[PDB]
Amino acid sequence: VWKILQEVMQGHPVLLNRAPTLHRLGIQAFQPILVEGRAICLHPLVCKGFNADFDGDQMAVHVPLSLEAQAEARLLMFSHMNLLSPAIGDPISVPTQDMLIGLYILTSGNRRGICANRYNPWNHKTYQNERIDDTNYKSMKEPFFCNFYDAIGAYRQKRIHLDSPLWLRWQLDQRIIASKEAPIEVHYESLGTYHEIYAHYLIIRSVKKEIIDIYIRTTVGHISLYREIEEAIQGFYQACS
Amino acid sequence: GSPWGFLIGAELTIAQSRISLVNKIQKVYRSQGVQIHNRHIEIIVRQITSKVLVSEDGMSNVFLPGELIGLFRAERTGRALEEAICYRATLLGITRASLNTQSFISEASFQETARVLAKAALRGRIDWLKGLKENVVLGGMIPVG
Amino acid sequence: KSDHIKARQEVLGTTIIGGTIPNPEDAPESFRLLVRELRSLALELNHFLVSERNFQINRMEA
Amino acid sequence: RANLVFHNKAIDGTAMKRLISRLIDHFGMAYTSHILDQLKTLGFQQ
Amino acid sequence: VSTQGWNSELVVDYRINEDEFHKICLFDCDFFIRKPPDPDNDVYDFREMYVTPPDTDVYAIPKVLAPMPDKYIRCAKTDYGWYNVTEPPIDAPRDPMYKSEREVSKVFLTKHYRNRRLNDPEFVLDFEEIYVIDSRTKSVTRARVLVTVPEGRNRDRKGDLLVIRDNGNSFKITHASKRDDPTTVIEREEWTRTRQDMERHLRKLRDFSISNWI
Amino acid sequence: RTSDAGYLTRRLVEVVQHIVVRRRDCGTIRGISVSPQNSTMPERILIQTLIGRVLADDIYMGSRCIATRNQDIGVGLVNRFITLRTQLISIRTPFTCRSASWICRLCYGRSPTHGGLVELGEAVGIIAGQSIGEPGTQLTLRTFHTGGVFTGGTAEHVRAPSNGKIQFNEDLVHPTRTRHGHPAFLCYIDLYVTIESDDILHNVNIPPKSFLLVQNDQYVESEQVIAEIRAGTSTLNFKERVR
Amino acid sequence: RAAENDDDDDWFPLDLYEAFEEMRKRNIFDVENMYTLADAWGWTWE
Amino acid sequence: KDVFMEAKLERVPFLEEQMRKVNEGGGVMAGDIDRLMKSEDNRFAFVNEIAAEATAYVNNNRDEYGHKKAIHHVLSNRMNDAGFARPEAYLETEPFSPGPTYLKE
Amino acid sequence: MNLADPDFYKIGYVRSFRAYGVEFREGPDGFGVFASKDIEPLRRARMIMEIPLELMLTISKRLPWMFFPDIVPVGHPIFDIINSTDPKTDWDLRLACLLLLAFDQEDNFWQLYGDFLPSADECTSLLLATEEDLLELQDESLELTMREQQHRCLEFWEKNWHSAAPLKIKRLARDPKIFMWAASIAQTRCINMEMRIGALIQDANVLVPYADMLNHSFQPNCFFHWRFKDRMLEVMINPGSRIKKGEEMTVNYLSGQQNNIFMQRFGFSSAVNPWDAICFSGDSRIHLDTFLSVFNITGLRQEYYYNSKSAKEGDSFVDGAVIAAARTLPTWSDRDVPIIPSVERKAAKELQEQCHEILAKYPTTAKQDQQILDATEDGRRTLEAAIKYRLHRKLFIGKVIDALEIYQDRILF
């Protein structure tokens, strides 16, 4: 029996309706699947569309029988072409409390100033100082990962934490929102090197060619979010041919 | 003159009422951090101010005085006829503007059912089934979407 | 899925077996009851279907 | 490689709403529905 | 139209061919310096200069705030830009999600060491003489570079790292061995700028006078 | 407060239920014209009024025309208006349609749900009633987090920058009695009360019609009110009478 | 009986101001729509 | 001449797992419906045309539908005439199932 | 038939251009669009060549001028040039100005796409020809029109590039032979369409990269469509039309108007020209329902068909010339239900023989004859093209005579 009631329901939409209907998005069509238990599982993003919490609430189901009615339900009341509210045209399905906290913690950055160093970095010392540059060379600095996936891989090994800063090479145009700004310190060797250090990125130009040395100071959280969005787009595009 | 003059006056009064009402409605929502586009306000406001009331001493033969014909209804015929049209204005409320509807079925299912049905039956009113509530009442298909 | 006396049976029939569900013609029994107790007060309520191609009145029976 | 902006700040509540609106206008309501599913999973994980 | 001053941008009613000049693109101006013939575009005869609003035919000599060379000097062209990344509105699908344009605001010109060649195996920049082309207020100024190297006047020019600083004002020359790391410079200003904010925030407490610890 | 909101939704929909987009351009030339350079509307209420609307008459810049008739106003087009200082923009609103029983696609504008011209046969009367009825309960939901404490008006106070010694000229101020019953000093001009905070000389800016509550050579603590800024009263709009 | 905020915002005077353009570009005195009332058919004929 | 030819064209790897979750979530149908509706002026007319075509499909070959969901059939037919393989009726299989029913989360 | 360079597909592909079953070639001609694989008959249409709006120029067709991919900046002193241009007469001038502007503004797409466009040595348009090359043409009305059209652009070159010429306006056309290249490109590759951008339906003259490469054939199999929502121009394969594995896919340039004096003006020359013929007069009249009956040509002038299911391959002598000269000739019909009088003295023979006398083997001027065809000399890309036009007009007249005498021979089976 269940093989039949797993076979006639695939492709037959059902209208879910919240009993205290308030707005237009209180009734929505969905593609049901058979779950084990006695409760209806609902997507969290559409919950604010239903204004539904989970302290105990009831949802009524309806089945469209007519072929025209099924076409209406599938092609007009699905929560992928009703993503905007009709009030002013603002998103109705946005990451709410828990997802919002996750994304905020992901994109929170490192510790900027005195919260990352106990003593001032002016501190003329630790130069490995002598008359020549032939001394101990540790220079822990920050990792110099090739690209995103190298950074994620190095994060998986627990080599670095989520908010530990790192340098990432950039092979694109300028994306990070900057402003009038100012380069803090641009070093210039006697030979053309154009060592520029901005607030959050470093540019090594020259006097001949190949201005490709763009390096970004970042953390693995921002890389993870950008990779998530980018691969979601490039996967939806190729999945849908 | 009289034909030009009150066409001008009624049009001015309706315009000023609309401008005042839109801002008065929107201020309450903007003072509480509520964002709604002006389309939804204006759609209701137009129905609030769209009908004139034929004032007294405007008998003629087409518009009996006391009638509540529409704004276009009056301003198109005033440009053609020459009697004492003599309407003034109505800023009908959200309740009264729905009782003076083109379909008696919709009004009868809103308020004052007995009075609406009695008046419609005595007059012999005809509903042409152009709205959405009347077609739902009869079980027929609504003419939307 | 409501008042129709003759249409619930036919959807049951065309849903046990399979066919294209036909749109109904007569009004649900709610409208019939409505016209019934508006008749008890000495009032009429008549439907009409004036044709767009012949102007012939097609008054429904209720 | 898409046409996106590399965020380097805190994406608070009002920034998420702005980002969804811009992704909707640039890609549509069919691409955004998949983004929201992915962001929901990534947000719940972290 | 010599290399005189002082603070007057005298206008010129004569159009001058720019195929023999130097096209120096800036934000709010466009300075012009004559280009004597040379195999690799490496001479700057200053003498006559003309500054115009961006892409405009109306010419005018700039403001000179320091003496300029009267000979042929082989120098290098630099820039000082920000790369504004403002995000424009989206009207139609596939509209760009970000913008980008350089905002060059200072064009330093560093003389070669005794005007050597570009490919000869003696290439050294002469960091003593550097000329600044501003954009906010059209004017050319000579830099005031400083040398902390103990060798002083007699030294090896094959590597003397030059440090520029806030808004193209400070200028120092240091031995190339003691070059600061990229992270140290960033961490330096972050530490200094956030220690003032913490002290400013804590100043309003009643116990600020009797305190310690930063 | 949820029953009254529900009742208002019933009446809002009742007025507009027959309003359906039945046709394209109805052939009207009267268009409501707005003036953005009056500097009256802030650039958040002005912007939300022009987006979606369709133009009624061409917009020029002398010789150059930047927006014609039957051209809806987008996002980037509004920025092209305030920046270029255009004084007259005429738009087609529901007020300008040639009918009261229905509406036009162009006399309505962009649909707020799918970013395009409103499609034929849309129950815009139903949408208008719901979208101005739902919010009605934020006038409740927004109150469904508090009780006894609400949002209203306040007053302005000036606190000491730090520990020190208030110094100023006591001659330019005129004795008074505060509404709390304390002696104070009205100042009708801009004073410069200085505080000798050991190494610092914090200058405090006192605008006129202020209520200096401190005397000369008086020691003050870090954060402590030393002067009211303007006026007083129960920090609200208009007067009542209570026993 | 009402808090007269008044706050005159977008009102207009009680005079004959703005004759040709009634309220911005709202209603120009036509004098071409309605001579035909007496010209297309008979009103000026008598 | 413009040096961005391949920096904007490098293939994003690791996409194989972000190709499947689209296919059981109904993402392919959702992203195909909008592309079919990308040229239609009035969506209601498009929906009515789809419904009428599905009704004709049910009438002509009755004894096949009940599983195939003829609306999915007509959608696949319309999407299959311009490339876009889109298997028949968007039918889903169970390649690895020595059992009758999945748990479905 | 070699494919184009890889850079051709890219640069535009990076800007959201998708081509599914085509591959542009590189061999010396108009680049050309030839397909791959087989499509088989379909129902409605197969979409191809997804071209966005951002890669266009699309000047409006009526006042005021608007450019939806905004090229002209605010206050730029080139909108005054366009706004001073005479409307409804020369749409190829302001379009040429837009094309010239989209060569020196920024890294615009047309700055890179210019290389693939034909150069001055290339191209066939007569606006780039010379005096004696225009004289090498068996036509005087066309000669007069093209001599005037080579002017009216010299005139609209000294009115806006005369020794004042702000450097923005200058450096775009330093001499009046690259402006001729832009004008010829605008004439050849402009298409007038309807563009629904938002709530605005407008008619506009537009330039479409990757779509002008679609060659011409009077028997077409491609539609031009404008997707209203996402603002994209698309080519569409005709319903119920089989497509081979590399054959030509063509979209017609002009239909319902021809005469080979305006098509030739817009590039190359006519080959079959199914809508052109020479006025005969000189005789009384020929029959109507026999010219289309011997070849089984379908009537209804606006739509003429051959009905390939005619006979056991009766002939291989149908062309555009036959379908054109089957409706531009005396063609008496009378009551349309006559006895079909087989009076060869009047209804046949001498009358068309009179046409044979009217077309007395090029009797007008006969400046040259059979010797001209295949002179075997290719040069300048505009010479040998006027010669080609002469060849094709002579071929059309000869094949019309041949078809007429075949018809007059076969009236009895």
Side-chain angles (χ1 to χ4, degrees), chain F:
Chain F
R1 213 191 275 266
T2 194
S3 175
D4 309 33
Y7 184 43
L8 190 44
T9 325
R10 279 188 25 83
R11 285 182 284 169
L12 283 182
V13 173
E14 189 36 65
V15 156
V16 284
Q17 42 101 33
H18 52 284
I19 309 294
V20 190
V21 191
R22 303 211 173 283
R23 258 176 270 281
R24 210 182 181 263
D25 196 349
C26 58
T28 196
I29 50 172
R30 295 283 153 230
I32 283 199
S33 69
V34 297
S35 57
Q37 293 324 140
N38 203 9
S39 176
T40 310
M41 331 294 192
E43 324 303 310
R44 289 173 25 47
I45 304 179
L46 191 83
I47 273 183
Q48 70 99 0
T49 316
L50 304 185
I51 42 149
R53 321 273 220 180
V54 194
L55 282 198
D57 105 292
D58 304 67
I59 285 321
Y60 268 94
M61 162 165 38
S63 40
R64 175 72 176 268
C65 187
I66 68 189
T68 173
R69 188 174 166 79
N70 292 347
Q71 174 156 324
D72 62 331
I73 288 155
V75 189
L77 180 49
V78 171
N79 303 92
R80 205 171 179 85
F81 283 164
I82 55 168
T83 295
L84 270 67
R85 286 151 212 152
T86 79
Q87 285 102 333
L88 180 94
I89 316 160
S90 47
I91 56 166
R92 298 176 73 169
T93 85
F95 291 148
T96 79
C97 202
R98 294 188 75 228
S99 194
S101 51
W102 47 274
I103 209 164
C104 160
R105 311 191 45 177
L106 285 148
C107 296
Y108 184 77
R110 283 209 193 143
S111 166
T113 85
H114 57 85
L117 248 196
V118 57
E119 281 143 356
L120 286 166
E122 279 213 2
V124 291
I126 303 296
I127 296 151
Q130 294 184 347
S131 307
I132 322 174
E134 203 287 327
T137 14
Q138 327 309 300
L139 311 192
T140 315
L141 293 165
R142 290 156 191 256
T143 60
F144 185 50
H145 82 274
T146 178
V149 282
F150 74 110
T151 54
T154 51
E156 271 66 0
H157 286 269
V158 153
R159 319 224 161 216
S162 65
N163 295 289
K165 181 181 173 181
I166 272 288
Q167 306 154 353
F168 69 102
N169 202 227
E170 215 163 19
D171 320 57
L172 325 162
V173 267
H174 322 83
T176 34
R177 191 182 213 245
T178 326
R179 70 186 176 287
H180 306 300
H182 306 94
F185 279 141
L186 258 165
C187 61
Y188 290 114
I189 47 140
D190 279 331
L191 270 148
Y192 282 110
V193 281
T194 195
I195 311 197
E196 166 191 334
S197 162
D198 304 8
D199 312 339
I200 313 308
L201 277 164
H202 312 88
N203 292 76
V204 202
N205 185 38
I206 307 287
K209 318 184 300 193
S210 296
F211 262 94
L212 250 169
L213 315 155
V214 81
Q215 247 173 354
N216 202 14
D217 308 19
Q218 175 161 347
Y219 188 91
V220 278
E221 294 274 31
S222 64
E223 57 259 15
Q224 145 199 330
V225 173
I226 63 169
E228 190 101 8
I229 278 300
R230 164 216 50 86
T233 59
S234 155
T235 59
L236 294 174
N237 192 15
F238 296 143
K239 274 88 180 186
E240 279 133 13
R241 264 209 208 285
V242 186
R243 337 190 81 77

Side-chain angles (χ1 to χ4, degrees), chain I residues 153-401:
Chain I
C153 329
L154 271 283
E155 206 283 329
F156 203 75
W157 183 87
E158 294 110 21
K159 199 186 165 287
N160 308 106
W161 271 270
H162 52 289
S163 307
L167 259 282
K168 289 172 300 314
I169 294 327
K170 218 192 276 186
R171 99 186 165 223
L172 303 181
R174 286 197 191 280
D175 39 4
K177 84 202 71 63
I178 55 182
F179 199 94
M180 291 325 178
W181 180 58
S184 154
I185 279 307
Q187 291 212 345
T188 45
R189 317 181 98 77
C190 159
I191 51 186
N192 316 351
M193 335 173 46
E194 271 206 350
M195 313 181 66
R196 182 157 153 98
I197 299 295
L200 174 78
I201 279 188
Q202 91 164 1
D203 224 300
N205 320 83
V206 311
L207 258 52
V208 282
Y210 296 132
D212 53 355
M213 297 315 148
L214 286 154
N215 290 303
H216 178 280
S217 156
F218 292 93
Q219 217 67 21
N221 49 7
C222 278
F223 303 150
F224 266 144
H225 196 28
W226 173 264
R227 260 194 278 136
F228 141 82
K229 284 253 159 185
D230 84 277
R231 294 181 199 180
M232 239 182 227
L233 179 141
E234 46 194 9
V235 187
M236 312 272 249
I237 308 295
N238 280 36
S241 293
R242 194 181 301 274
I243 285 304
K244 265 67 178 179
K245 203 202 147 304
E247 89 293 9
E248 204 190 357
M249 286 163 331
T250 88
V251 47
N252 189 0
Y253 287 22
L254 301 176
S255 266
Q257 175 31 295
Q258 194 185 83
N259 293 332
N260 317 345
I261 42 185
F262 332 122
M263 153 57 67
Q264 151 75 55
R265 164 221 316 283
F266 265 48
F268 42 89
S269 174
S270 317
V272 290
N273 52 271
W275 258 97
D276 165 48
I278 168 167
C279 54
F280 292 147
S281 183
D283 72 326
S284 69
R285 260 165 115 74
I286 327 178
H287 187 227
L288 204 171
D289 314 69
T290 37
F291 215 144
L292 91 174
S293 275
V294 292
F295 313 135
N296 314 157
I297 273 292
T298 325
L300 274 176
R301 281 168 44 71
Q302 318 275 330
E303 58 247 40
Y304 256 43
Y305 197 36
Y306 164 100
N307 188 58
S308 181
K309 317 297 184 133
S310 58
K312 48 183 83 163
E313 201 172 352
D315 69 307
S316 293
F317 194 64
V318 85
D319 263 348
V322 193
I323 205 156
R327 44 158 178 259
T328 315
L329 72 164
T331 42
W332 80 254
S333 47
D334 282 351
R335 194 46 199 80
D336 290 276
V337 70
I339 62 169
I340 316 106
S342 186
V343 305
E344 268 66 59
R345 321 302 313 263
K346 179 183 55 200
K349 296 293 173 294
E350 271 42 77
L351 269 298
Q352 35 271 66
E353 273 308 304
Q354 207 49 244
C355 297
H356 288 67
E357 174 40 37
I358 287 136
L359 322 172
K361 276 75 190 167
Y362 314 140
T364 85
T365 183
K367 293 195 280 288
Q368 177 118 224
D369 283 317
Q370 196 266 300
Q371 332 312 329
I372 184 173
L373 84 89
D374 283 87
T376 324
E377 179 64 33
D378 44 349
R380 295 202 41 266
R381 279 309 223 176
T382 165
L383 277 200
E384 171 275 350
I387 290 111
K388 262 323 273 183
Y389 172 71
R390 301 183 40 138
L391 297 204
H392 272 293
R393 184 182 173 79
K394 277 168 194 136
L395 253 61
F396 164 77
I397 296 152
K399 299 229 156 179
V400 159
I401 279 181

